[PDB]
Write an enzyme that holds these catalytic residues in place. Structure first.
Site, PDB file in Angstrom:
ATOM      1  N   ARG A  25       0.839  -1.167   0.000  1.00 61.35           N
ATOM      2  CA  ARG A  25       0.000   0.000   0.000  1.00 61.35           C
ATOM      3  C   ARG A  25       0.892   1.241   0.000  1.00 61.35           C
ATOM      4  NH1 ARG A  25      -1.788   3.753   5.081  1.00 61.35           N
ATOM      5  NH2 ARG A  25      -4.070   3.562   4.853  1.00 61.35           N
ATOM      6  N   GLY A  29      -2.276   3.754  -3.979  1.00 63.12           N
ATOM      7  CA  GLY A  29      -2.736   2.460  -4.429  1.00 63.12           C
ATOM      8  C   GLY A  29      -2.605   1.407  -3.367  1.00 63.12           C
ATOM      9  N   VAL A  31      -1.940  -2.723  -3.450  1.00 64.71           N
ATOM     10  CA  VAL A  31      -1.504  -3.708  -4.426  1.00 64.71           C
ATOM     11  C   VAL A  31      -1.535  -5.124  -3.863  1.00 64.71           C
ATOM     12  CG1 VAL A  31       0.489  -2.133  -4.377  1.00 64.71           C
ATOM     13  CG2 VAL A  31       0.757  -4.500  -5.266  1.00 64.71           C
ATOM     14  N   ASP A 143      11.352  10.643  -7.472  1.00 65.31           N
ATOM     15  CA  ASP A 143      10.795  10.205  -6.210  1.00 65.31           C
ATOM     16  C   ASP A 143      11.200   8.806  -5.789  1.00 65.31           C
ATOM     17  OD1 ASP A 143       9.170  10.709  -3.965  1.00 65.31           O
ATOM     18  OD2 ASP A 143       7.638   9.354  -4.836  1.00 65.31           O
TER      19      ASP A 143
HETATM   20  N1  ANP Z   1       5.227  -5.119  -8.643  1.00 63.07           N
HETATM   21  C1  ANP Z   1       5.105  -5.192  -7.311  1.00 63.07           C
HETATM   22  N2  ANP Z   1       5.363  -6.340  -6.707  1.00 63.07           N
HETATM   23  C2  ANP Z   1       5.284  -6.495  -5.362  1.00 63.07           C
HETATM   24  N3  ANP Z   1       4.919  -5.516  -4.530  1.00 63.07           N
HETATM   25  C3  ANP Z   1       4.615  -4.303  -5.004  1.00 63.07           C
HETATM   26  C4  ANP Z   1       4.682  -4.059  -6.455  1.00 63.07           C
HETATM   27  N4  ANP Z   1       4.341  -2.785  -6.633  1.00 63.07           N
HETATM   28  C5  ANP Z   1       4.061  -2.268  -5.407  1.00 63.07           C
HETATM   29  N5  ANP Z   1       4.237  -3.179  -4.431  1.00 63.07           N
HETATM   30  C6  ANP Z   1       4.030  -2.986  -2.978  1.00 63.07           C
HETATM   31  O1  ANP Z   1       3.078  -1.940  -2.826  1.00 63.07           O
HETATM   32  C7  ANP Z   1       3.678  -0.776  -2.240  1.00 63.07           C
HETATM   33  C8  ANP Z   1       3.130   0.498  -2.855  1.00 63.07           C
HETATM   34  O2  ANP Z   1       3.466   0.602  -4.244  1.00 63.07           O
HETATM   35  P1  ANP Z   1       3.596   2.045  -4.943  1.00 63.07           P
HETATM   36  O3  ANP Z   1       3.834   1.823  -6.433  1.00 63.07           O
HETATM   37  O4  ANP Z   1       4.491   2.906  -4.133  1.00 63.07           O
HETATM   38  O5  ANP Z   1       2.092   2.494  -4.680  1.00 63.07           O
HETATM   39  P2  ANP Z   1       1.562   4.004  -4.807  1.00 63.07           P
HETATM   40  O6  ANP Z   1       0.720   4.236  -3.559  1.00 63.07           O
HETATM   41  O7  ANP Z   1       0.773   4.031  -6.071  1.00 63.07           O
HETATM   42  N6  ANP Z   1       2.955   5.025  -4.872  1.00 63.07           N
HETATM   43  P3  ANP Z   1       3.556   5.756  -3.395  1.00 63.07           P
HETATM   44  O8  ANP Z   1       2.345   6.372  -2.794  1.00 63.07           O
HETATM   45  O9  ANP Z   1       4.594   6.681  -3.962  1.00 63.07           O
HETATM   46  O10 ANP Z   1       4.097   4.601  -2.583  1.00 63.07           O
HETATM   47  C9  ANP Z   1       5.163  -0.996  -2.432  1.00 63.07           C
HETATM   48  O11 ANP Z   1       5.948  -0.265  -1.499  1.00 63.07           O
HETATM   49  C10 ANP Z   1       5.284  -2.496  -2.287  1.00 63.07           C
HETATM   50  O12 ANP Z   1       5.274  -2.895  -0.907  1.00 63.07           O
END
Ligand code: ANP
Length: 369
Positions: A25, A29, A31, A143
């Site tokens: 999270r 998002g 995930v 970032d």
């Molecule tokens: N391809 C992936 N495989 C496994 N875990 C993932 C993957 N992408 C994201 N995660 C997990 O989900 C977390 C959040 O992903 P992220 O792309 O940072 O989400 P976001 O909320 O859209 N961006 P941010 O708010 O900058 O963290 C990561 O820190 C991982 O723990």
């Protein structure tokens, strides 16, 4: 008497994807681990909600998606699929399907395990190969942080989360701990040196994992945890404060870059101080290691070590793979530009074209042209 295993509930995705469970999270998002019957592999599925409320946020997810879709590297996470929205004209959700990774550096830093120095090195080098590819594609990620440096059990690093990236030419939780001073200071222009700074911060936290630096996993901390992450002047004053507490008030040569008088005068009014001695903080590593760390963390974006020099740095000789530094890739072109103000209409078009890239037969509504 609710079931916590009802976190899977909100995730509605084509029947070929079997949602397994929540993995991570961020501020935008959630995930999820899922298995793909059609491909025979595990994938990650990022769900983003409420995506047209704020159009700056909308543009953010478009940037993340368009960039990853046009990147082709073992060091950047793959865009496996984009799920067709059910309501092509009024969808407010989006399911981003990605290559799965085992972990990420933010998780590792919390685990009660210790790394050897070869581990630290292997990981930093892998990170830097990724940044090189980002550079050679004419992108600044802007970032980089432990959360978006995904990790696999073999020590390979895959970068993600390119929504803040820029091209080389509501309220959320906002982490400023890995932001370069020039960025903190909001200067007109900036180079990839901005990602090297972030890399330096991450390196300090990789160094924390060695038992000789920190004997108790509970007590690993980021190097610059100054700013408060929950909802321009004060947050950035604290973040700038802690940076100077570590590397020192800057010398005059570092201030020659700066354009705006008021910024110089803002800087100058932080009482002169010397850094900490990082050799004393990280005293199990060579003087070369400390050089690499201190070069990445130079206030002067110009004097800050480059990607190429970091890859060839003596501290990383032990792990270097010059074979993999030399690749050929072109500068990617994004279907929109930074300056472009874009309507809901226009942003829905670009999304659907990207979604159409994965789904050949998708028909874009006439209303959205
Ligand atoms: N391809 C992936 N495989 C496994 N875990 C993932 C993957 N992408 C994201 N995660 C997990 O989900 C977390 C959040 O992903 P992220 O792309 O940072 O989400 P976001 O909320 O859209 N961006 P941010 O708010 O900058 O963290 C990561 O820190 C991982 O723990």
């Amino acid at each position: 008497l609710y079931f916590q295993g009802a976190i899977i509930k909100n995730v509605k995705v084509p029947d070929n994807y079997e949602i397994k469970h929540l993995i991570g999270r961020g501020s935008y998002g959630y995930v999820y681990l899922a298995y793909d019957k059609n491909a025979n592999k595990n994938v990650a599925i990022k769900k983003v909600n409420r995506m047209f409320e704020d159009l700056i946020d909308c543009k953010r997810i478009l940037r993340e998606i368009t960039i990853l879709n046009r990147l082709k590297s073992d060091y950047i996470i793959r865009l496996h699929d984009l799920i067709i929205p059910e309501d092509l004209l009024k969808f407010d959700e989006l399911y981003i399907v990605l290559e799965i990774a085992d972990s990420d550096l933010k998780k590792l830093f919390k685990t009660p395990i210790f790394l050897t120095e070869q581990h630290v090195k292997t990981i930093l080098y892998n990170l830097l190969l990724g940044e090189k590819f980002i550079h050679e594609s004419g992108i600044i990620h802007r970032d980089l942080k432990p959360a978006n440096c995904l990790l696999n059990q073999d020590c390979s690093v895959k970068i993600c989360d390119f929504g803040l990236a820029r091209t080389i030419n509501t309220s959320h939780v906002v982490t400023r701990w890995y932001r370069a001073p020039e960025l903190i200071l909001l200067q007109e222009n900036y180079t990839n040196s901005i990602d090297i700074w972030s890399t330096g911060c991450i390196f300090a936290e990789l160094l924390n994992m060695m038992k000789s630096h920190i004997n108790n996993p509970t007590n690993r901390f980021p190097l610059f945890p100054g700013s408060s992450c929950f909802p321009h002047e004060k947050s950035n004053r604290d973040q700038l404060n802690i940076i100077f507490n570590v590397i020192g008030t800057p010398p005059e040569e570092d201030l020659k870059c700066i354009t705006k008088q008021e910024v110089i005068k803002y800087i100058k009014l932080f009482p002169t101080r010397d850094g900490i001695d990082l050799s004393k903080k990280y005293s199990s590593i060579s003087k070369e290691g400390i050089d690499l760390l201190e070069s990445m963390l130079r206030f002067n974006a110009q004097k800050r070590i480059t990607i190429d020099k970091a890859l060839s740095h003596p501290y990383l000789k032990d792990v270097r793979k010059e074979n993999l530094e030399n690749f050929s890739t072109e500068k990617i072109i994004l279907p929109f530009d930074d300056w472009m103000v874009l309507s809901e209409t226009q942003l829905r078009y670009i999304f659907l074209k990207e979604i159409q890239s994965f789904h050949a037969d998708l028909i874009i509504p006439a209303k959205l042209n």
